[PDB]
Amino acid sequence: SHMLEDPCTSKKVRAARTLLAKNLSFNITEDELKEVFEDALEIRLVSQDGKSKGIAYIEFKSEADAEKNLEEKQGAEIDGRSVSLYYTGEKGGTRG
């Protein structure tokens, strides 16, 4: 419990190396997201209550990875639409 410095439970620190991909398409998929980032641990998908909406989660190995990729690409113009990058280490907010 002593640790050196991390009185936040390391809960909101994991989302720092992860970001949400948006503006995707009904054709793109984790593959295109994994092919666009090619620098994260893995990407997740996200649609409506039950219908592809074009959203996907993305967790990199570190904030610099999710950030360098989210910025180095940001959109990457794919499926006729650039995949939007929505971080989640200090921006999103959903009391849950």
PDB file of all heavy atoms in Angstrom, residues 16-49:
ATOM      1  N   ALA A  16      -5.872   6.656 -19.715  1.00  0.00           N
ATOM      2  CA  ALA A  16      -4.934   7.608 -20.377  1.00  0.00           C
ATOM      3  C   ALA A  16      -4.295   6.957 -21.604  1.00  0.00           C
ATOM      4  O   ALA A  16      -4.143   7.576 -22.637  1.00  0.00           O
ATOM      5  CB  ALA A  16      -3.875   7.922 -19.320  1.00  0.00           C
ATOM      6  N   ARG A  17      -3.924   5.714 -21.499  1.00  0.00           N
ATOM      7  CA  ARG A  17      -3.299   5.026 -22.663  1.00  0.00           C
ATOM      8  C   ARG A  17      -4.383   4.405 -23.547  1.00  0.00           C
ATOM      9  O   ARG A  17      -4.131   3.487 -24.302  1.00  0.00           O
ATOM     10  CB  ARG A  17      -2.412   3.939 -22.055  1.00  0.00           C
ATOM     11  CG  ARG A  17      -3.239   3.080 -21.097  1.00  0.00           C
ATOM     12  CD  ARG A  17      -2.833   3.391 -19.655  1.00  0.00           C
ATOM     13  NE  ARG A  17      -2.435   2.078 -19.076  1.00  0.00           N
ATOM     14  CZ  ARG A  17      -1.192   1.864 -18.738  1.00  0.00           C
ATOM     15  NH1 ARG A  17      -0.563   2.725 -17.987  1.00  0.00           N
ATOM     16  NH2 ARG A  17      -0.580   0.788 -19.152  1.00  0.00           N
ATOM     17  N   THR A  18      -5.588   4.899 -23.459  1.00  0.00           N
ATOM     18  CA  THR A  18      -6.686   4.336 -24.296  1.00  0.00           C
ATOM     19  C   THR A  18      -7.563   5.463 -24.851  1.00  0.00           C
ATOM     20  O   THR A  18      -7.716   6.502 -24.240  1.00  0.00           O
ATOM     21  CB  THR A  18      -7.492   3.448 -23.346  1.00  0.00           C
ATOM     22  OG1 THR A  18      -6.698   2.338 -22.951  1.00  0.00           O
ATOM     23  CG2 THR A  18      -8.752   2.950 -24.054  1.00  0.00           C
ATOM     24  N   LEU A  19      -8.141   5.262 -26.003  1.00  0.00           N
ATOM     25  CA  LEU A  19      -9.009   6.317 -26.598  1.00  0.00           C
ATOM     26  C   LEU A  19     -10.158   5.677 -27.382  1.00  0.00           C
ATOM     27  O   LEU A  19     -10.094   4.527 -27.771  1.00  0.00           O
ATOM     28  CB  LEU A  19      -8.093   7.107 -27.534  1.00  0.00           C
ATOM     29  CG  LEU A  19      -7.404   6.147 -28.504  1.00  0.00           C
ATOM     30  CD1 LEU A  19      -8.183   6.105 -29.820  1.00  0.00           C
ATOM     31  CD2 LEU A  19      -5.979   6.636 -28.772  1.00  0.00           C
ATOM     32  N   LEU A  20     -11.208   6.413 -27.612  1.00  0.00           N
ATOM     33  CA  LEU A  20     -12.368   5.851 -28.365  1.00  0.00           C
ATOM     34  C   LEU A  20     -12.331   6.308 -29.828  1.00  0.00           C
ATOM     35  O   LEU A  20     -12.126   7.469 -30.118  1.00  0.00           O
ATOM     36  CB  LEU A  20     -13.602   6.416 -27.665  1.00  0.00           C
ATOM     37  CG  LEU A  20     -14.845   5.649 -28.119  1.00  0.00           C
ATOM     38  CD1 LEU A  20     -15.060   4.440 -27.208  1.00  0.00           C
ATOM     39  CD2 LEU A  20     -16.066   6.568 -28.041  1.00  0.00           C
ATOM     40  N   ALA A  21     -12.538   5.405 -30.750  1.00  0.00           N
ATOM     41  CA  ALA A  21     -12.526   5.794 -32.188  1.00  0.00           C
ATOM     42  C   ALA A  21     -13.953   6.083 -32.657  1.00  0.00           C
ATOM     43  O   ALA A  21     -14.860   5.310 -32.422  1.00  0.00           O
ATOM     44  CB  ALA A  21     -11.952   4.583 -32.923  1.00  0.00           C
ATOM     45  N   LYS A  22     -14.161   7.192 -33.313  1.00  0.00           N
ATOM     46  CA  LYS A  22     -15.535   7.526 -33.788  1.00  0.00           C
ATOM     47  C   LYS A  22     -15.505   7.921 -35.267  1.00  0.00           C
ATOM     48  O   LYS A  22     -14.476   7.881 -35.911  1.00  0.00           O
ATOM     49  CB  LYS A  22     -15.971   8.711 -32.927  1.00  0.00           C
ATOM     50  CG  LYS A  22     -17.476   8.626 -32.663  1.00  0.00           C
ATOM     51  CD  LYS A  22     -18.048  10.036 -32.510  1.00  0.00           C
ATOM     52  CE  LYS A  22     -18.684  10.184 -31.127  1.00  0.00           C
ATOM     53  NZ  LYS A  22     -17.834  11.180 -30.418  1.00  0.00           N
ATOM     54  N   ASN A  23     -16.629   8.300 -35.807  1.00  0.00           N
ATOM     55  CA  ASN A  23     -16.670   8.699 -37.243  1.00  0.00           C
ATOM     56  C   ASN A  23     -16.300   7.508 -38.131  1.00  0.00           C
ATOM     57  O   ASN A  23     -16.009   7.659 -39.301  1.00  0.00           O
ATOM     58  CB  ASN A  23     -15.632   9.811 -37.375  1.00  0.00           C
ATOM     59  CG  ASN A  23     -16.090  10.818 -38.431  1.00  0.00           C
ATOM     60  OD1 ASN A  23     -15.900  12.008 -38.276  1.00  0.00           O
ATOM     61  ND2 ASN A  23     -16.688  10.389 -39.508  1.00  0.00           N
ATOM     62  N   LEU A  24     -16.310   6.324 -37.584  1.00  0.00           N
ATOM     63  CA  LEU A  24     -15.961   5.125 -38.397  1.00  0.00           C
ATOM     64  C   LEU A  24     -17.040   4.873 -39.452  1.00  0.00           C
ATOM     65  O   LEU A  24     -17.611   5.794 -40.002  1.00  0.00           O
ATOM     66  CB  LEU A  24     -15.908   3.969 -37.398  1.00  0.00           C
ATOM     67  CG  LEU A  24     -14.909   4.297 -36.286  1.00  0.00           C
ATOM     68  CD1 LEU A  24     -14.959   3.204 -35.217  1.00  0.00           C
ATOM     69  CD2 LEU A  24     -13.498   4.370 -36.874  1.00  0.00           C
ATOM     70  N   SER A  25     -17.325   3.633 -39.737  1.00  0.00           N
ATOM     71  CA  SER A  25     -18.369   3.324 -40.755  1.00  0.00           C
ATOM     72  C   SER A  25     -18.898   1.902 -40.553  1.00  0.00           C
ATOM     73  O   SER A  25     -18.373   1.139 -39.766  1.00  0.00           O
ATOM     74  CB  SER A  25     -17.657   3.444 -42.102  1.00  0.00           C
ATOM     75  OG  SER A  25     -18.451   4.225 -42.984  1.00  0.00           O
ATOM     76  N   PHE A  26     -19.933   1.539 -41.260  1.00  0.00           N
ATOM     77  CA  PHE A  26     -20.494   0.169 -41.110  1.00  0.00           C
ATOM     78  C   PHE A  26     -19.560  -0.853 -41.766  1.00  0.00           C
ATOM     79  O   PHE A  26     -19.742  -2.048 -41.637  1.00  0.00           O
ATOM     80  CB  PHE A  26     -21.835   0.218 -41.842  1.00  0.00           C
ATOM     81  CG  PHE A  26     -22.959   0.297 -40.836  1.00  0.00           C
ATOM     82  CD1 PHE A  26     -23.297   1.528 -40.262  1.00  0.00           C
ATOM     83  CD2 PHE A  26     -23.664  -0.860 -40.480  1.00  0.00           C
ATOM     84  CE1 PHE A  26     -24.340   1.603 -39.332  1.00  0.00           C
ATOM     85  CE2 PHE A  26     -24.706  -0.784 -39.549  1.00  0.00           C
ATOM     86  CZ  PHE A  26     -25.044   0.448 -38.975  1.00  0.00           C
ATOM     87  N   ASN A  27     -18.564  -0.390 -42.470  1.00  0.00           N
ATOM     88  CA  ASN A  27     -17.621  -1.326 -43.134  1.00  0.00           C
ATOM     89  C   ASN A  27     -16.340  -1.469 -42.309  1.00  0.00           C
ATOM     90  O   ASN A  27     -15.877  -2.562 -42.050  1.00  0.00           O
ATOM     91  CB  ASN A  27     -17.318  -0.686 -44.491  1.00  0.00           C
ATOM     92  CG  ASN A  27     -17.686  -1.662 -45.609  1.00  0.00           C
ATOM     93  OD1 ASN A  27     -18.775  -2.200 -45.630  1.00  0.00           O
ATOM     94  ND2 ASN A  27     -16.815  -1.916 -46.549  1.00  0.00           N
ATOM     95  N   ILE A  28     -15.759  -0.374 -41.897  1.00  0.00           N
ATOM     96  CA  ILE A  28     -14.507  -0.455 -41.092  1.00  0.00           C
ATOM     97  C   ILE A  28     -14.705  -1.414 -39.912  1.00  0.00           C
ATOM     98  O   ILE A  28     -15.805  -1.836 -39.619  1.00  0.00           O
ATOM     99  CB  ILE A  28     -14.237   0.990 -40.629  1.00  0.00           C
ATOM    100  CG1 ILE A  28     -13.011   1.525 -41.369  1.00  0.00           C
ATOM    101  CG2 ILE A  28     -13.975   1.054 -39.118  1.00  0.00           C
ATOM    102  CD1 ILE A  28     -12.882   3.028 -41.120  1.00  0.00           C
ATOM    103  N   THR A  29     -13.641  -1.754 -39.238  1.00  0.00           N
ATOM    104  CA  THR A  29     -13.754  -2.685 -38.076  1.00  0.00           C
ATOM    105  C   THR A  29     -12.475  -2.649 -37.234  1.00  0.00           C
ATOM    106  O   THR A  29     -11.539  -1.926 -37.527  1.00  0.00           O
ATOM    107  CB  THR A  29     -13.928  -4.073 -38.697  1.00  0.00           C
ATOM    108  OG1 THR A  29     -13.119  -4.170 -39.862  1.00  0.00           O
ATOM    109  CG2 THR A  29     -15.394  -4.297 -39.069  1.00  0.00           C
ATOM    110  N   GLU A  30     -12.423  -3.440 -36.196  1.00  0.00           N
ATOM    111  CA  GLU A  30     -11.202  -3.465 -35.345  1.00  0.00           C
ATOM    112  C   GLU A  30      -9.973  -3.642 -36.235  1.00  0.00           C
ATOM    113  O   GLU A  30      -8.908  -3.128 -35.955  1.00  0.00           O
ATOM    114  CB  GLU A  30     -11.381  -4.674 -34.425  1.00  0.00           C
ATOM    115  CG  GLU A  30     -11.132  -4.255 -32.975  1.00  0.00           C
ATOM    116  CD  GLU A  30     -12.382  -3.573 -32.418  1.00  0.00           C
ATOM    117  OE1 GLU A  30     -13.425  -4.206 -32.410  1.00  0.00           O
ATOM    118  OE2 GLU A  30     -12.277  -2.428 -32.007  1.00  0.00           O
ATOM    119  N   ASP A  31     -10.122  -4.358 -37.316  1.00  0.00           N
ATOM    120  CA  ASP A  31      -8.972  -4.560 -38.238  1.00  0.00           C
ATOM    121  C   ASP A  31      -8.482  -3.206 -38.742  1.00  0.00           C
ATOM    122  O   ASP A  31      -7.332  -2.849 -38.584  1.00  0.00           O
ATOM    123  CB  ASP A  31      -9.528  -5.398 -39.391  1.00  0.00           C
ATOM    124  CG  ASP A  31      -8.415  -6.273 -39.970  1.00  0.00           C
ATOM    125  OD1 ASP A  31      -7.266  -5.872 -39.881  1.00  0.00           O
ATOM    126  OD2 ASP A  31      -8.730  -7.330 -40.492  1.00  0.00           O
ATOM    127  N   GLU A  32      -9.353  -2.443 -39.338  1.00  0.00           N
ATOM    128  CA  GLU A  32      -8.943  -1.102 -39.840  1.00  0.00           C
ATOM    129  C   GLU A  32      -8.459  -0.246 -38.672  1.00  0.00           C
ATOM    130  O   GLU A  32      -7.536   0.539 -38.797  1.00  0.00           O
ATOM    131  CB  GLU A  32     -10.204  -0.500 -40.462  1.00  0.00           C
ATOM    132  CG  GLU A  32     -10.368  -1.019 -41.891  1.00  0.00           C
ATOM    133  CD  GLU A  32     -11.541  -1.998 -41.950  1.00  0.00           C
ATOM    134  OE1 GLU A  32     -11.990  -2.416 -40.896  1.00  0.00           O
ATOM    135  OE2 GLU A  32     -11.970  -2.314 -43.047  1.00  0.00           O
ATOM    136  N   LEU A  33      -9.060  -0.409 -37.527  1.00  0.00           N
ATOM    137  CA  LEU A  33      -8.623   0.376 -36.346  1.00  0.00           C
ATOM    138  C   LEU A  33      -7.262  -0.141 -35.907  1.00  0.00           C
ATOM    139  O   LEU A  33      -6.386   0.609 -35.523  1.00  0.00           O
ATOM    140  CB  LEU A  33      -9.679   0.113 -35.272  1.00  0.00           C
ATOM    141  CG  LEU A  33     -10.809   1.135 -35.408  1.00  0.00           C
ATOM    142  CD1 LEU A  33     -11.726   0.731 -36.563  1.00  0.00           C
ATOM    143  CD2 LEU A  33     -11.615   1.179 -34.109  1.00  0.00           C
ATOM    144  N   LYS A  34      -7.073  -1.429 -35.987  1.00  0.00           N
ATOM    145  CA  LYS A  34      -5.766  -2.004 -35.599  1.00  0.00           C
ATOM    146  C   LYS A  34      -4.750  -1.710 -36.695  1.00  0.00           C
ATOM    147  O   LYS A  34      -3.559  -1.645 -36.464  1.00  0.00           O
ATOM    148  CB  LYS A  34      -6.005  -3.507 -35.457  1.00  0.00           C
ATOM    149  CG  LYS A  34      -4.784  -4.159 -34.804  1.00  0.00           C
ATOM    150  CD  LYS A  34      -4.073  -5.049 -35.825  1.00  0.00           C
ATOM    151  CE  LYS A  34      -3.380  -6.204 -35.100  1.00  0.00           C
ATOM    152  NZ  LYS A  34      -1.994  -5.721 -34.847  1.00  0.00           N
ATOM    153  N   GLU A  35      -5.228  -1.514 -37.887  1.00  0.00           N
ATOM    154  CA  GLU A  35      -4.325  -1.201 -39.020  1.00  0.00           C
ATOM    155  C   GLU A  35      -4.031   0.299 -39.029  1.00  0.00           C
ATOM    156  O   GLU A  35      -3.012   0.743 -39.520  1.00  0.00           O
ATOM    157  CB  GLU A  35      -5.097  -1.609 -40.275  1.00  0.00           C
ATOM    158  CG  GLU A  35      -4.149  -2.304 -41.254  1.00  0.00           C
ATOM    159  CD  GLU A  35      -3.801  -3.697 -40.727  1.00  0.00           C
ATOM    160  OE1 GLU A  35      -3.941  -3.910 -39.534  1.00  0.00           O
ATOM    161  OE2 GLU A  35      -3.399  -4.528 -41.525  1.00  0.00           O
ATOM    162  N   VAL A  36      -4.916   1.083 -38.473  1.00  0.00           N
ATOM    163  CA  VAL A  36      -4.689   2.552 -38.431  1.00  0.00           C
ATOM    164  C   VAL A  36      -3.808   2.886 -37.232  1.00  0.00           C
ATOM    165  O   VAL A  36      -2.896   3.685 -37.320  1.00  0.00           O
ATOM    166  CB  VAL A  36      -6.080   3.168 -38.269  1.00  0.00           C
ATOM    167  CG1 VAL A  36      -5.951   4.610 -37.774  1.00  0.00           C
ATOM    168  CG2 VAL A  36      -6.801   3.158 -39.619  1.00  0.00           C
ATOM    169  N   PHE A  37      -4.071   2.276 -36.109  1.00  0.00           N
ATOM    170  CA  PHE A  37      -3.251   2.551 -34.910  1.00  0.00           C
ATOM    171  C   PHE A  37      -1.954   1.746 -34.969  1.00  0.00           C
ATOM    172  O   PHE A  37      -0.872   2.265 -34.776  1.00  0.00           O
ATOM    173  CB  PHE A  37      -4.119   2.098 -33.739  1.00  0.00           C
ATOM    174  CG  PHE A  37      -5.523   2.627 -33.909  1.00  0.00           C
ATOM    175  CD1 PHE A  37      -6.599   1.944 -33.333  1.00  0.00           C
ATOM    176  CD2 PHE A  37      -5.749   3.800 -34.640  1.00  0.00           C
ATOM    177  CE1 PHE A  37      -7.902   2.431 -33.489  1.00  0.00           C
ATOM    178  CE2 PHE A  37      -7.052   4.288 -34.795  1.00  0.00           C
ATOM    179  CZ  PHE A  37      -8.129   3.604 -34.220  1.00  0.00           C
ATOM    180  N   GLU A  38      -2.064   0.480 -35.238  1.00  0.00           N
ATOM    181  CA  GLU A  38      -0.851  -0.386 -35.320  1.00  0.00           C
ATOM    182  C   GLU A  38       0.144  -0.022 -34.215  1.00  0.00           C
ATOM    183  O   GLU A  38       1.337  -0.207 -34.356  1.00  0.00           O
ATOM    184  CB  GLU A  38      -0.252  -0.098 -36.697  1.00  0.00           C
ATOM    185  CG  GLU A  38      -0.451  -1.313 -37.606  1.00  0.00           C
ATOM    186  CD  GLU A  38       0.289  -2.516 -37.019  1.00  0.00           C
ATOM    187  OE1 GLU A  38       0.892  -2.362 -35.970  1.00  0.00           O
ATOM    188  OE2 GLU A  38       0.240  -3.571 -37.629  1.00  0.00           O
ATOM    189  N   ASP A  39      -0.334   0.494 -33.116  1.00  0.00           N
ATOM    190  CA  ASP A  39       0.590   0.868 -32.006  1.00  0.00           C
ATOM    191  C   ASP A  39      -0.129   0.780 -30.658  1.00  0.00           C
ATOM    192  O   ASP A  39       0.345   1.285 -29.660  1.00  0.00           O
ATOM    193  CB  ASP A  39       1.000   2.311 -32.302  1.00  0.00           C
ATOM    194  CG  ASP A  39       2.407   2.564 -31.756  1.00  0.00           C
ATOM    195  OD1 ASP A  39       3.170   1.617 -31.677  1.00  0.00           O
ATOM    196  OD2 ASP A  39       2.696   3.703 -31.426  1.00  0.00           O
ATOM    197  N   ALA A  40      -1.269   0.147 -30.617  1.00  0.00           N
ATOM    198  CA  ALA A  40      -2.006   0.035 -29.328  1.00  0.00           C
ATOM    199  C   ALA A  40      -2.134  -1.434 -28.915  1.00  0.00           C
ATOM    200  O   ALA A  40      -1.780  -2.330 -29.656  1.00  0.00           O
ATOM    201  CB  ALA A  40      -3.383   0.637 -29.604  1.00  0.00           C
ATOM    202  N   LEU A  41      -2.639  -1.689 -27.738  1.00  0.00           N
ATOM    203  CA  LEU A  41      -2.791  -3.094 -27.281  1.00  0.00           C
ATOM    204  C   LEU A  41      -3.939  -3.763 -28.030  1.00  0.00           C
ATOM    205  O   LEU A  41      -3.849  -4.902 -28.444  1.00  0.00           O
ATOM    206  CB  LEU A  41      -3.121  -2.996 -25.792  1.00  0.00           C
ATOM    207  CG  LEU A  41      -2.056  -2.164 -25.085  1.00  0.00           C
ATOM    208  CD1 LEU A  41      -2.573  -1.744 -23.708  1.00  0.00           C
ATOM    209  CD2 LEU A  41      -0.786  -3.002 -24.920  1.00  0.00           C
ATOM    210  N   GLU A  42      -5.022  -3.060 -28.203  1.00  0.00           N
ATOM    211  CA  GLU A  42      -6.185  -3.651 -28.921  1.00  0.00           C
ATOM    212  C   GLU A  42      -7.304  -2.616 -29.061  1.00  0.00           C
ATOM    213  O   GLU A  42      -7.340  -1.624 -28.358  1.00  0.00           O
ATOM    214  CB  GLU A  42      -6.631  -4.823 -28.044  1.00  0.00           C
ATOM    215  CG  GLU A  42      -7.377  -4.294 -26.818  1.00  0.00           C
ATOM    216  CD  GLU A  42      -7.876  -5.470 -25.976  1.00  0.00           C
ATOM    217  OE1 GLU A  42      -7.235  -6.508 -26.006  1.00  0.00           O
ATOM    218  OE2 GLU A  42      -8.890  -5.314 -25.317  1.00  0.00           O
ATOM    219  N   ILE A  43      -8.218  -2.839 -29.966  1.00  0.00           N
ATOM    220  CA  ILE A  43      -9.331  -1.868 -30.155  1.00  0.00           C
ATOM    221  C   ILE A  43     -10.681  -2.557 -29.965  1.00  0.00           C
ATOM    222  O   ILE A  43     -10.854  -3.716 -30.287  1.00  0.00           O
ATOM    223  CB  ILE A  43      -9.190  -1.375 -31.593  1.00  0.00           C
ATOM    224  CG1 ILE A  43      -7.878  -0.604 -31.743  1.00  0.00           C
ATOM    225  CG2 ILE A  43     -10.363  -0.454 -31.935  1.00  0.00           C
ATOM    226  CD1 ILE A  43      -6.857  -1.473 -32.479  1.00  0.00           C
ATOM    227  N   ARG A  44     -11.642  -1.844 -29.451  1.00  0.00           N
ATOM    228  CA  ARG A  44     -12.991  -2.436 -29.243  1.00  0.00           C
ATOM    229  C   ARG A  44     -13.993  -1.773 -30.192  1.00  0.00           C
ATOM    230  O   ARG A  44     -13.708  -0.755 -30.792  1.00  0.00           O
ATOM    231  CB  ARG A  44     -13.328  -2.130 -27.785  1.00  0.00           C
ATOM    232  CG  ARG A  44     -13.155  -3.397 -26.949  1.00  0.00           C
ATOM    233  CD  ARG A  44     -14.503  -4.111 -26.814  1.00  0.00           C
ATOM    234  NE  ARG A  44     -15.266  -3.308 -25.821  1.00  0.00           N
ATOM    235  CZ  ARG A  44     -16.078  -3.900 -24.988  1.00  0.00           C
ATOM    236  NH1 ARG A  44     -16.447  -5.134 -25.200  1.00  0.00           N
ATOM    237  NH2 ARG A  44     -16.523  -3.258 -23.943  1.00  0.00           N
ATOM    238  N   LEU A  45     -15.158  -2.338 -30.341  1.00  0.00           N
ATOM    239  CA  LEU A  45     -16.162  -1.734 -31.261  1.00  0.00           C
ATOM    240  C   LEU A  45     -17.310  -1.115 -30.464  1.00  0.00           C
ATOM    241  O   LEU A  45     -17.507  -1.418 -29.304  1.00  0.00           O
ATOM    242  CB  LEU A  45     -16.668  -2.896 -32.114  1.00  0.00           C
ATOM    243  CG  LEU A  45     -17.391  -2.348 -33.346  1.00  0.00           C
ATOM    244  CD1 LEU A  45     -16.492  -1.338 -34.060  1.00  0.00           C
ATOM    245  CD2 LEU A  45     -17.718  -3.501 -34.298  1.00  0.00           C
ATOM    246  N   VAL A  46     -18.066  -0.248 -31.077  1.00  0.00           N
ATOM    247  CA  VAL A  46     -19.196   0.391 -30.354  1.00  0.00           C
ATOM    248  C   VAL A  46     -20.265   0.875 -31.343  1.00  0.00           C
ATOM    249  O   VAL A  46     -19.990   1.612 -32.284  1.00  0.00           O
ATOM    250  CB  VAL A  46     -18.567   1.562 -29.600  1.00  0.00           C
ATOM    251  CG1 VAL A  46     -19.668   2.412 -28.966  1.00  0.00           C
ATOM    252  CG2 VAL A  46     -17.648   1.018 -28.503  1.00  0.00           C
ATOM    253  N   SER A  47     -21.485   0.450 -31.130  1.00  0.00           N
ATOM    254  CA  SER A  47     -22.605   0.846 -32.030  1.00  0.00           C
ATOM    255  C   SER A  47     -23.787   1.364 -31.205  1.00  0.00           C
ATOM    256  O   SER A  47     -23.639   1.744 -30.061  1.00  0.00           O
ATOM    257  CB  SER A  47     -22.986  -0.440 -32.759  1.00  0.00           C
ATOM    258  OG  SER A  47     -23.606  -1.333 -31.843  1.00  0.00           O
ATOM    259  N   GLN A  48     -24.960   1.379 -31.776  1.00  0.00           N
ATOM    260  CA  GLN A  48     -26.150   1.868 -31.023  1.00  0.00           C
ATOM    261  C   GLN A  48     -26.735   0.740 -30.169  1.00  0.00           C
ATOM    262  O   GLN A  48     -26.158  -0.323 -30.050  1.00  0.00           O
ATOM    263  CB  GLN A  48     -27.150   2.301 -32.097  1.00  0.00           C
ATOM    264  CG  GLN A  48     -26.524   3.392 -32.968  1.00  0.00           C
ATOM    265  CD  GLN A  48     -27.625   4.306 -33.508  1.00  0.00           C
ATOM    266  OE1 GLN A  48     -27.981   5.283 -32.883  1.00  0.00           O
ATOM    267  NE2 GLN A  48     -28.183   4.026 -34.655  1.00  0.00           N
ATOM    268  N   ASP A  49     -27.875   0.961 -29.575  1.00  0.00           N
ATOM    269  CA  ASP A  49     -28.494  -0.102 -28.732  1.00  0.00           C
ATOM    270  C   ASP A  49     -28.394  -1.457 -29.437  1.00  0.00           C
ATOM    271  O   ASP A  49     -28.379  -2.496 -28.809  1.00  0.00           O
ATOM    272  CB  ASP A  49     -29.957   0.316 -28.576  1.00  0.00           C
ATOM    273  CG  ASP A  49     -30.752  -0.831 -27.950  1.00  0.00           C
ATOM    274  OD1 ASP A  49     -30.155  -1.618 -27.234  1.00  0.00           O
ATOM    275  OD2 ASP A  49     -31.944  -0.903 -28.198  1.00  0.00           O
TER     276      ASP A  49
END
